[PDB]
Design an enzyme around this catalytic site. Sequence first.
Site, PDB file in Angstrom:
ATOM      1  N   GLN A  16       0.825  -1.206   0.000  1.00 36.40           N
ATOM      2  CA  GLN A  16       0.000   0.000   0.000  1.00 36.40           C
ATOM      3  C   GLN A  16       0.860   1.256   0.000  1.00 36.40           C
ATOM      4  O   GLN A  16       0.566   2.220  -0.724  1.00 36.40           O
ATOM      5  CB  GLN A  16      -0.935  -0.007   1.208  1.00 36.40           C
ATOM      6  CG  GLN A  16      -1.722   1.275   1.396  1.00 36.40           C
ATOM      7  CD  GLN A  16      -2.785   1.148   2.461  1.00 36.40           C
ATOM      8  OE1 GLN A  16      -2.861   0.138   3.160  1.00 36.40           O
ATOM      9  NE2 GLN A  16      -3.617   2.172   2.590  1.00 36.40           N
ATOM     10  N   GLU A  70      -4.215  -6.503  -2.000  1.00 35.27           N
ATOM     11  CA  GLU A  70      -5.512  -5.980  -1.620  1.00 35.27           C
ATOM     12  C   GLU A  70      -6.056  -5.082  -2.727  1.00 35.27           C
ATOM     13  O   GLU A  70      -5.316  -4.253  -3.266  1.00 35.27           O
ATOM     14  CB  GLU A  70      -5.410  -5.187  -0.308  1.00 35.27           C
ATOM     15  CG  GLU A  70      -6.738  -4.773   0.298  1.00 35.27           C
ATOM     16  CD  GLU A  70      -6.653  -3.458   1.040  1.00 35.27           C
ATOM     17  OE1 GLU A  70      -5.707  -2.686   0.778  1.00 35.27           O
ATOM     18  OE2 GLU A  70      -7.532  -3.195   1.888  1.00 35.27           O
ATOM     19  N   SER A 120       7.322  -0.890   1.921  1.00 36.30           N
ATOM     20  CA  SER A 120       7.403  -0.567   3.333  1.00 36.30           C
ATOM     21  C   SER A 120       7.784  -1.815   4.109  1.00 36.30           C
ATOM     22  O   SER A 120       7.438  -2.937   3.729  1.00 36.30           O
ATOM     23  CB  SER A 120       6.082  -0.016   3.870  1.00 36.30           C
ATOM     24  OG  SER A 120       5.122  -1.048   4.010  1.00 36.30           O
ATOM     25  N   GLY A 159       3.580  -7.631   5.602  1.00 37.13           N
ATOM     26  CA  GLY A 159       2.567  -8.130   4.701  1.00 37.13           C
ATOM     27  C   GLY A 159       3.012  -8.196   3.257  1.00 37.13           C
ATOM     28  O   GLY A 159       3.939  -8.935   2.916  1.00 37.13           O
ATOM     29  N   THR A 160       2.334  -7.432   2.399  1.00 37.14           N
ATOM     30  CA  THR A 160       2.689  -7.391   0.985  1.00 37.14           C
ATOM     31  C   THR A 160       4.051  -6.744   0.773  1.00 37.14           C
ATOM     32  O   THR A 160       4.840  -7.212  -0.055  1.00 37.14           O
ATOM     33  CB  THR A 160       1.606  -6.644   0.205  1.00 37.14           C
ATOM     34  OG1 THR A 160       0.341  -7.277   0.428  1.00 37.14           O
ATOM     35  CG2 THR A 160       1.894  -6.668  -1.283  1.00 37.14           C
ATOM     36  N   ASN A 169       9.115   7.509   8.816  1.00 36.65           N
ATOM     37  CA  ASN A 169       7.908   8.327   8.874  1.00 36.65           C
ATOM     38  C   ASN A 169       8.028   9.435   9.911  1.00 36.65           C
ATOM     39  O   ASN A 169       7.609  10.568   9.656  1.00 36.65           O
ATOM     40  CB  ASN A 169       6.692   7.448   9.167  1.00 36.65           C
ATOM     41  CG  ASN A 169       6.184   6.722   7.936  1.00 36.65           C
ATOM     42  OD1 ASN A 169       5.121   6.104   7.963  1.00 36.65           O
ATOM     43  ND2 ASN A 169       6.938   6.798   6.846  1.00 36.65           N
ATOM     44  N   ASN A 227       4.731  11.249   0.870  1.00 37.99           N
ATOM     45  CA  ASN A 227       5.040  10.606  -0.399  1.00 37.99           C
ATOM     46  C   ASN A 227       5.532  11.603  -1.437  1.00 37.99           C
ATOM     47  O   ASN A 227       6.367  11.247  -2.272  1.00 37.99           O
ATOM     48  CB  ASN A 227       3.816   9.856  -0.909  1.00 37.99           C
ATOM     49  CG  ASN A 227       3.425   8.718  -0.001  1.00 37.99           C
ATOM     50  OD1 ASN A 227       3.998   8.541   1.073  1.00 37.99           O
ATOM     51  ND2 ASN A 227       2.430   7.953  -0.411  1.00 37.99           N
ATOM     52  N   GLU A 271      27.541   4.330 -11.853  1.00 37.36           N
ATOM     53  CA  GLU A 271      28.542   5.239 -11.299  1.00 37.36           C
ATOM     54  C   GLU A 271      28.191   5.627  -9.870  1.00 37.36           C
ATOM     55  O   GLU A 271      29.071   5.710  -9.002  1.00 37.36           O
ATOM     56  CB  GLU A 271      28.655   6.473 -12.190  1.00 37.36           C
ATOM     57  CG  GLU A 271      29.720   7.474 -11.807  1.00 37.36           C
ATOM     58  CD  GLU A 271      29.743   8.656 -12.757  1.00 37.36           C
ATOM     59  OE1 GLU A 271      29.295   8.494 -13.912  1.00 37.36           O
ATOM     60  OE2 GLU A 271      30.209   9.741 -12.361  1.00 37.36           O
TER      61      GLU A 271
HETATM   62  N1  LIG Z   1       5.482   7.292   3.881  1.00 34.96           N
HETATM   63  C1  LIG Z   1       4.391   6.545   3.749  1.00 34.96           C
HETATM   64  N2  LIG Z   1       4.290   5.351   4.431  1.00 34.96           N
HETATM   65  C2  LIG Z   1       3.181   4.585   4.304  1.00 34.96           C
HETATM   66  C3  LIG Z   1       2.140   4.990   3.485  1.00 34.96           C
HETATM   67  N3  LIG Z   1       1.173   4.051   3.541  1.00 34.96           N
HETATM   68  C4  LIG Z   1       1.577   3.062   4.366  1.00 34.96           C
HETATM   69  N4  LIG Z   1       2.814   3.385   4.857  1.00 34.96           N
HETATM   70  C5  LIG Z   1       3.623   2.565   5.775  1.00 34.96           C
HETATM   71  O1  LIG Z   1       3.133   1.241   5.755  1.00 34.96           O
HETATM   72  C6  LIG Z   1       3.074   0.692   7.051  1.00 34.96           C
HETATM   73  C7  LIG Z   1       1.833  -0.183   7.174  1.00 34.96           C
HETATM   74  O2  LIG Z   1       1.976  -1.387   6.451  1.00 34.96           O
HETATM   75  P1  LIG Z   1       1.539  -1.497   4.905  1.00 34.96           P
HETATM   76  O3  LIG Z   1       2.578  -0.912   3.981  1.00 34.96           O
HETATM   77  O4  LIG Z   1       0.205  -0.822   4.710  1.00 34.96           O
HETATM   78  O5  LIG Z   1       1.385  -3.074   4.632  1.00 34.96           O
HETATM   79  P2  LIG Z   1       1.204  -3.587   3.122  1.00 34.96           P
HETATM   80  O6  LIG Z   1       2.466  -3.326   2.339  1.00 34.96           O
HETATM   81  O7  LIG Z   1       0.025  -2.892   2.490  1.00 34.96           O
HETATM   82  O8  LIG Z   1       0.927  -5.168   3.228  1.00 34.96           O
HETATM   83  P3  LIG Z   1      -0.352  -5.723   4.028  1.00 34.96           P
HETATM   84  O9  LIG Z   1      -0.178  -5.435   5.497  1.00 34.96           O
HETATM   85  O10 LIG Z   1      -0.483  -7.211   3.817  1.00 34.96           O
HETATM   86  O11 LIG Z   1      -1.587  -5.029   3.510  1.00 34.96           O
HETATM   87  C8  LIG Z   1       3.025   1.870   8.006  1.00 34.96           C
HETATM   88  O12 LIG Z   1       3.888   1.648   9.095  1.00 34.96           O
HETATM   89  C9  LIG Z   1       3.501   3.062   7.203  1.00 34.96           C
HETATM   90  O13 LIG Z   1       4.761   3.486   7.667  1.00 34.96           O
HETATM   91  C10 LIG Z   1       2.235   6.189   2.796  1.00 34.96           C
HETATM   92  O14 LIG Z   1       1.313   6.556   2.069  1.00 34.96           O
HETATM   93  N5  LIG Z   1       3.364   6.966   2.931  1.00 34.96           N
HETATM   94 MG   LIG Z   2      -2.467  -3.081   2.916  1.00 32.51          MG
END
Ligand SMILES: Nc1nc2c(ncn2[C@@H]2O[C@H](COP(=O)(O)OP(=O)(O)OP(=O)(O)O)[C@@H](O)[C@H]2O)c(=O)[nH]1
Ligand SMILES: [Mg+2]
Lengths: 431, 431, 54, 52, 52, 437, 437
Positions: free
Chosen positions: G11, G71, G140, G144-145, G206, G228, G254
Amino acid sequence: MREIVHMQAGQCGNQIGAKFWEVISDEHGIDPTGTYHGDSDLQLERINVYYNEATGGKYVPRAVLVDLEPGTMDSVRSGPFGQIFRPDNFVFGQSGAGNNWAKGHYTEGAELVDSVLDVVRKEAESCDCLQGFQLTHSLGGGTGSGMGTLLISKIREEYPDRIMNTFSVVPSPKVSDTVVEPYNATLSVHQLVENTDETYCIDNEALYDICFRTLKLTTPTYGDLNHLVSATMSGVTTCLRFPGQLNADLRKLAVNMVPFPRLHFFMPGFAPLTSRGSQQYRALTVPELTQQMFDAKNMMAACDPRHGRYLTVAAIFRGRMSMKEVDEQMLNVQNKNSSYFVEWIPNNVKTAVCDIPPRGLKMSATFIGNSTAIQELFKRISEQFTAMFRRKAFLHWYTGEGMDEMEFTEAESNMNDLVSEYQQYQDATAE
Amino acid sequence: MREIVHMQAGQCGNQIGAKFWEVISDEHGIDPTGTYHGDSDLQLERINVYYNEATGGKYVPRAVLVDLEPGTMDSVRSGPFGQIFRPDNFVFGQSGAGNNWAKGHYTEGAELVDSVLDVVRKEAESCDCLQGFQLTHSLGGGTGSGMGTLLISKIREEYPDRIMNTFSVVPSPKVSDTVVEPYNATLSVHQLVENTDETYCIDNEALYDICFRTLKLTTPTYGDLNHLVSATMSGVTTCLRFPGQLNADLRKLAVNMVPFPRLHFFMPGFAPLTSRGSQQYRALTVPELTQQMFDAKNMMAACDPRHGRYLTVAAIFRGRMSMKEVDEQMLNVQNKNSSYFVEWIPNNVKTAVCDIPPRGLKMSATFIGNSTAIQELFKRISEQFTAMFRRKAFLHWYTGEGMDEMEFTEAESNMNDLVSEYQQYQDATAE
Amino acid sequence: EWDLYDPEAKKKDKPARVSDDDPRCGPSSIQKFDGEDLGGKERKKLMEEQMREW
Amino acid sequence: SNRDPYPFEKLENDTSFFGTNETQKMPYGEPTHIAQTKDPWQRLNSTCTLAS
Amino acid sequence: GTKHNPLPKGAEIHQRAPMVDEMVFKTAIKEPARWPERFKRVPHAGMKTTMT
Amino acid sequence: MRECISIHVGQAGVQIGNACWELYCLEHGIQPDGQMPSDKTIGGGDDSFNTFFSETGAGKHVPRAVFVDLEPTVVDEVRTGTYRQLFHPEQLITGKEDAANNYARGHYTIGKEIVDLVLDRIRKLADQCTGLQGFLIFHSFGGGTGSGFASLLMERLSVDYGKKSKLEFAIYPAPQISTAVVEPYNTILTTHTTLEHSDCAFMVDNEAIYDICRRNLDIERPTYTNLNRLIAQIVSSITASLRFDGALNVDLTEFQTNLVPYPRIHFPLATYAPVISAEKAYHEQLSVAEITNACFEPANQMVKCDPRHGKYMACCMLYRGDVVPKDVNAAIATIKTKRTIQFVDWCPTGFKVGINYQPPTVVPGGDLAKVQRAVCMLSNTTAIAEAWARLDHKFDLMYAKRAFVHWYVGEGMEEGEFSEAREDLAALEKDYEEVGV
Amino acid sequence: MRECISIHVGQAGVQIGNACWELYCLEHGIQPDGQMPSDKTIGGGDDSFNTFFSETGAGKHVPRAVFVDLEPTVVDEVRTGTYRQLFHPEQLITGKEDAANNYARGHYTIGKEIVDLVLDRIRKLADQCTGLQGFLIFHSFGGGTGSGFASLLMERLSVDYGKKSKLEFAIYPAPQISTAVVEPYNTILTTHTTLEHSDCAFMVDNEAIYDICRRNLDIERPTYTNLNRLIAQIVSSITASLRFDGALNVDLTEFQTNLVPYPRIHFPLATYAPVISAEKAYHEQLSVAEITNACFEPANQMVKCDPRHGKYMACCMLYRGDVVPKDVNAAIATIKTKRTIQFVDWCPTGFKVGINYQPPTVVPGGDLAKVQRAVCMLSNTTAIAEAWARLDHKFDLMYAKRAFVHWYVGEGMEEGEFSEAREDLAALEKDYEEVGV
Ligand SMILES: Nc1nc2c(ncn2[C@@H]2O[C@H](COP(=O)(O)OP(=O)(O)OP(=O)(O)O)[C@@H](O)[C@H]2O)c(=O)[nH]1
Ligand SMILES: [Mg+2]
Ligand SMILES: Nc1nc2c(ncn2[C@@H]2O[C@H](COP(=O)(O)OP(=O)(O)OP(=O)(O)O)[C@@H](O)[C@H]2O)c(=O)[nH]1
Ligand SMILES: Nc1nc2c(ncn2[C@@H]2O[C@H](COP(=O)(O)OP(=O)(O)O)[C@@H](O)[C@H]2O)c(=O)[nH]1
Ligand SMILES: Nc1nc2c(ncn2[C@@H]2O[C@H](COP(=O)(O)OP(=O)(O)O)[C@@H](O)[C@H]2O)c(=O)[nH]1
Ligand SMILES: [Mg+2]
């Protein structure tokens, strides 16, 4: 007035002849209808070499177009500059070749041989001092290999004293347009060794190389590939059609480039050849023509001239030029690249000079080389033949039309014998 | 006669040589379209040193443009006099050196070296009396440090007696701009010391100081630096390109400046240089030219000649002056500070006075000095190399491409040998 | 024979082709090939527009 | 062969992604007629369909 | 194909002044171009050899 | 005058014929009533129709097809549909009772009543022609007339016409999708006529075309209409080298010679693969390299067997449209230097490249995008043995305890025919695996 | 001729891709429906889009990005929002069940259902390339994903595209601010795919971006959109040298050769300056010295970490805008003289400079003011071991009680993964300690 009669076997040979007749007609002033519209009197002076005078100012090319499928004949008859040929030399069957050397040599094609020999004998009777025969065809195809080699055999049997030259578009393992190219090329080279007088090997990979890395050309297709071969043909034959200070006919080329009877596979070249951006930066002189003519990236065979020894080299120049600089350039290339020239033939280079350049040019050059590097292409074809012959793949097609495996073994053995002969004369010492 | 083949390797060499061709074409009257529109026959009598005649007034520079990235080709075509180069001399690979000596020398420079050698043989066998090869490049990069020294090697062991000179923008600790500059410089100086004949050793720090202190120039940028370097490259061959009272070409310079073969690392200097604020406070005299030559701030190398000893000095003066004044002004600058000159080479100053100053200038003067202070640059490079190589930092990048760490050992050890040789030859007594 | 060893022979010479529409360049001088897609840009633009409308 | 029949702009490939996979050539092994007299190729050449 | 040619061969607009390859020179040059400055030569010591 | 006769046997043959002669008429400018205006013809066409249609001398273009089906339903739907006046009434042939998914009822009884009439119509269509290239036979292995009657018919063409090339576009049962129970029996029993009475035996799988329709054309609910349209596109791309101009155009026997290494090996895969919807075609180049890689992608095949478990033996490309050979050669080089595509060792060069100067035609209401470049790739792989083995196991599971055999026994077809067909299937499988190793 | 393939997984990856491709469309002048008008691209060539966009057969431009998520929420937000016609529908891959903050579910259960599809789409986007700089994997560490499926994808990419570079941008958890309970487990488990399958890892935090947007952008409540946008500025400044022309152009190879000293040492810290707001841009002259001094301050770093207690090993300066290469040398001299930057003893020259002549673009509705010059500083520092030690402490706090382990074991992960992953990270921070000393 030494007449040369042309033969175009197969689709590739027919298209090469189609380009060849329009470059010849532009050199000699003949329009697509047939009428001479030139200005110089030297154009309509040796016109009887390629053109028979019909009623009026019509000049019919002395060419025989041979095929089995009607498609290429319909293309060359309905395309531009296609009404100049006599509509009795368009001899063709109605079946196909199927890329089968047996369908070219034993069945289908062998039924058309009587009619082709009929029209060829009529065109030869139309001459007075016919010098020889020229054939354009492609190894690796159908009627280009089998029917062409059968025509060569019959013509050599009927006229066993005439200069026979073929232009022999050989297959390449890198373009790879047909699976049974090793079979067709191996079965056709064996016929080309013991029948023809000289064979100018043309390779599509090298033609694409000289189309891409020399002339840029973006999208070159088959028209440029046929154009280069046609220009090479005209540059070879220019000394019979136009005068000069140092003339050399095809028999002179054959005498001065064939040391031993089983050595006539040549490497052609033509070298005013530059791209649009480099036209203005290139100055057209004899050293520039000589350099581009001896450059390894300018040959129309897939060889590397630096990978072997030049047995003989012949250069046919065209235009008003200094014989002194021509001679010292032909000697300078030997003295610098003396390691790529064979040692037991002193001054491997023949010079011919014509005084009439091609129309629109001020000077031109044509390369014919007899280097010992053509064993590379022959070794590639031989190894592909034995690779797909060890398991006898695609052999039921050839053996179901009247051909034994003994012919395949004999062709492979003789072609390796030719390769061994080239290697032996490459590795032969001076004394 | 006396032809020079110019080669430019890397981005820095390409930009410096582009400014060099701008300066040379301005001096010779060549237009940016390539045509000659000068005012005197002196610009045309010696035009063949750097140029090839084409059709019309076109002159094509005898330059070979090498870099491993295509962006430099756009950056060198963006300049004026960008269309004068032949498009066949634009030899560019499709990748990028990545500031890696091993990339430039062993992996992808090896795929480009055959094409560059082909085009340099093109530009070399056309010359009747080819004199030498000049190369501009920068140590510290990947193409100048890598491909450039590889080119030095192949051009050397193809042409023994021809004068090789490289201009060599060496790294500097203060300019920095690249972490692997000690590795690249140490690996390249080994091929510099064994396969060249004159190395000129410019660096960006002294270039900034010259463009910064005696020219002010609030925004110094890179064009002014390349202008200074280009003026030096023109001044080292003005006696070859123009008539004069005393003539000294590159061969006489190499004779009179190289006592021993591994001592050919010079420092350059070109000295009608004043700021536009200080411009009206000048006398415009030969003593002023000599004094501002020997001032230890106009050296294009960061080595201080005061912290060293001058083995040989060459001064190429340019304009209309008197030999008595020239000889007196380069004799008193030995007699006064004779403690900075070697005692075992008496009168170690060679002067060459031309007669045609550069366009827009009344007098100019180029200084070349074979001082023993080049060990300062080499020792700074060594003291930065031995910190990285102790912990083997950034070594996997070099050693994943076939290279061994014993090659780094040889580079550092042979450079230490060069430093020790320079120290012994400056501290050697007369007897 | 002064035209053949004139010192200014290259000065008084034309390259081979000059422009895209040289009357010298025919099917024999082979400085004019049909492979040079001089209309290729317009043909490509026609193909982009035609795919877009389809 | 060093001749390049392909255009200037060439798309990427497994030789640039992973690396060149060319191996070598096996020395030749059995001769041609012994290789021809192997079972599941000589049987296929001998047995022909009715259409063939 | 089509009975009528969409872009006829005769109705083509070629470039004009100096023709350049688009295969190796990708970027084009819009050429009203700035030529560099010309320092005027010294009027009495520009081109005078000591012999003359 | 390079004529080919199209014989459509069974309901699957007849529906493919409906979706195929529609494409032929719309490609050659033939109206459904039987006239060429001038506009819908290919430029310079004039006689380019003269491999599928025949002049009556007055303007009528009668197609060179024989629609056969023992059931009189779908053929009378042809007789009622929009191509009512296009077909000669004798070209559409019906019986009274269908074979009812029974190879015995298609081959020995019932179907042995109109085979001579169909052969007489084929003979009339054959001696009307002058340059007959061959017969394209369209049927299915689902059973009955498409297996038994097509077996009998193609057998009698094989013993009669001889030198004419008999292409087969056979519909194969899927690994899991099947619309009938006796499909393994009806497919085992007909392998002899595809094995020894056919010169080339292109096969398609309904589940594979379903998967292609769902992934590529974005049709979540495809049908037999879209399946037969894709098959018709394949056959048109095959035959266009006999119809229009091209550089290296092939003539049936040409790619047979360049395709089959041995007489027993004539079962290749056929992939037409600029297959895409218009919305998805809006976002790609659809260049030569793309449409060449899409053929070797093992998810765009019309038989559910990925060739990564086998070795290629001969690939024939049939390119259509603005496809210069300089791009086809680069695409072939990229395919050769691909990892997963493995060619057999005794085939050093294995590409028969053919180019035609004619882009594909599009049917209104169709699901394919109007591209200008096309590839139909015919590849001989050692991976159709997967489908052969799936058929073999599904047949053995039934023949172990002899289900549905009384239907076949009570209508001719002595009990040893099942064992004989199983044995020659095993022989063909052994041949493919020993070629693969 | 240059291309970079972007893979946005998770996500966070999808949302960063939304902001990032908004920034790229603004930079290259491409409208959201996919058309580039007037084709000028001031400060660059005509082909300047070719790094990130590719031409189509209809004249449209499609990005070289693949947005994968398990998702269907954020991918449908992309497919519904304004950048709808820009993206190819096959480039936006989504699943049915998300991994639900479970590395085992993302790596062993759900990832091995669309790993083949994402590899096929990556293969198509790489086959349509002519010079490939590498991959940019945006994910991230939160779980999860973005951890398990990203690990599987990079493990496949490392064995398929061995030669190509693989930069990654990973969102790393903060010391205090966090949104998942099992994310220490996920972060520990995902270290191996960043140590053996990544060539450079830009770790962003973050909390650090929250503090930057609080003290510099003068906004009290920043959000993920703001985060972002500021993250996308980093990769835009990185690929500026590939896209637009400049004095010193630094490509990815490089970059890596001048950044990483050792193959295991590929974890630098990213920062950007100026990150000033529009009202604050009135009151100071933003020159090279000020932006370089702002980049080395321990408050503009994008990991919550003090680099004054560590040692700088190498730094990549990336200037972008009104930058002359002499002000750069002045700023570097001032930095080398000033004390709190302590360089490691084996790097005498510790700076690699890339200067680009294209000022950064402002996004409407954004916060960054339009500025003459900017600089992105990418420093390999021995201080990231503080963050990894915080992570190890938080992981060992729960693994002693063995909480939240039955989920991973039931989904398929063996319990030895946690032990070997913590051992790997402990040895890795020991490697940074040994490199620092
Ligand atoms: N900088 C930034 N970080 C984000 C953003 N959205 C989610 N995150 C990071 O993502 C973490 C939450 O886990 P997700 O990335 O949503 O997990 P996922 O990759 O979607 O995988 P699943 O949990 O299976 O859905 C948080 O701790 C945030 O730091 C975003 O829009 N900007
Ligand atoms: Mg998610
Ligand atoms: N692709 C495709 N396949 C079809 C179509 N119609 C029928 N089939 C196939 O045909 C199989 C069923 O056997 P049929 O062809 O209907 O049997 P038949 O040849 O008509 O002979 P009978 O059994 O007497 O009806 C099914 O499994 C389908 O796969 C069609 O329109 N398109
Ligand atoms: N240079 C050139 N080669 C061609 C041309 N046409 C076909 N070929 C080559 O010839 C080979 C096939 O030979 P072909 O002409 O079909 O012989 P045929 O079967 O007797 O007609 C192919 O590999 C092509 O590469 C052409 O116009 N020019
Ligand atoms: N004097 C001068 N130095 C330059 C120029 N361009 C680059 N440099 C210096 O060269 C070094 C990098 O060399 P580089 O151009 O990358 O070498 P390459 O990789 O072989 O092209 C930098 O530290 C610059 O200071 C130039 O035009 N003039
Ligand atoms: Mg039915």
